[PDB]
Amino acid sequence: PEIRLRHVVSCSSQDSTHCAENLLKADTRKWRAAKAGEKTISVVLQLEKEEQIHSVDIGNDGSAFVEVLVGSSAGGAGEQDYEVLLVTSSFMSPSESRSGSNPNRVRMFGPDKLVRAAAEKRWDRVKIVCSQPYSKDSPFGLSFVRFHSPP
């Protein structure tokens, strides 16, 4: 089951037209770094309700690595208040990144591919960190993202 994303809690960097809110709208309509040349960008999405994450889809847009953390509204929300659900994953090699090739890779991350510790628990916030240090030209961010709860 697709989890429903409520709104955007935060965003370290976002383009005027390719803003962080597009991670809500279905299609691709992207999230992108205000300035390419940046090395990582981040967002916090609030969920419609506390639920358990079973599976994650990631739709890439020029990013070299993607990491997904989780948290809750309760207990505040700072830096290391968040737990790593999906550990930094590869979407784009240095060579491809240096040459803007295959920015659009898409990936599924089933239960096994999540840090089981954190996935047993349930949350209502998700931190998403996108990295791209192999270029200071190409735009980078995400096409889309889909979180899932067990059937």
């Binding site: 690595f65 990491e67 968040y82 790593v84 930094t88 840090v115 960190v129 240090p133």
Partner: protein, 248 residues
């Protein structure tokens, strides 16, 4: 003389760690002369390591290394061409002499997600036995072979010294991380790993993984060559020859 002095000596025999070395002392076995009278008190590994004690303390000229490399790489190619064997250590860094031949082996069909396949290594091992390259075994492991080999000396020819050979079987997807680590130079591997952490990555014998925003090591990244590893950390590729104890 000093007990530690006796111990420090025994350790120099292959297969005699400090534990086994103290047990030989108590039983009165302090010297080589003593060890050679007490083979029953040693396991095979040690029994043979002592057999070639003299030959294993000598250095190996690069000319011999090369001859050795050829024997190995040939049989391995003829056996199955998809094999990949890379002699590593100081030899790979272009040292004029080695202390021993460190071979690393791999095969596309053997990944870290696949099934353990000792026979990939044993097939290579038993062939080297046929062609009379590997004279003796020290330890026939599932992933690492430890043993003895000798260059051929057709007759009337004064025989070559016996040499230590290691053969590590490694998953293909971890191969060039192994080569990096086992070619390295202690200091180079230390310096490269440190810069890894600078650029937010973690290199080890097996893999290079990105470090998340909270510092949790991510998934092993795809590596099909040493270059790939350098690229990940955006560090200029150093040829093995320049992996000295001089850094730039």
């Amino acid at each position: 003389d000093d007990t530690s002095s006796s111990i420090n000596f025994l350790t120099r025999v292959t297969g005699i760690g400090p534990s086994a070395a103290r047990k030989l002392v108590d039983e009165g076995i302090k010297t080589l002369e003593d060890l050679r009278k007490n083979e029953d008190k040693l396991n095979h590994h040690q029994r043979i390591g002592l057999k070639y004690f003299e030959d294993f303390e000598k250095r190996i000229p690069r000319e011999e290394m090369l001859q050795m490399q050829d024997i190995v790489l040939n049989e391995v190619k003829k056996l199955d061409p998809e094999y990949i064997a890379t002699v590593c250590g100081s030899f790979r860094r272009g040292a004029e002499s080695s202390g021993d031949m460190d071979v690393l082996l791999t095969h596309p069909n053997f990944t870290s997600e696949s099934s353990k396949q000792p026979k990939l290594l044993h097939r290579v091992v038993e062939q080297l036995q046929k062609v009379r390259f590997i004279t003796d075994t020290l330890s026939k492991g599932e992933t690492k072979f430890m043993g003895v080999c000798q260059l051929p000396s057709e007759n009337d020819e004064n025989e070559y010294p016996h040499r230590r050979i290691d053969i590590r079987l490694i998953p293909k997807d971890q191969y060039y991380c192994g080569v990096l680590y086992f070619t390295g130079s202690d200091i180079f591997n230390k310096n490269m790993r440190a810069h890894a952490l600078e650029k937010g990555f973690t290199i080890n014998e097996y893999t290079i993984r990105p470090l998340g925003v909270t510092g949790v090591a991510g998934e092993p990244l795809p590596v099909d060559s040493e270059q790939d590893i350098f690229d990940y950390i955006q560090w200029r590729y150093r040829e093995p020859k320049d992996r000295s104890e001089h850094h730039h």
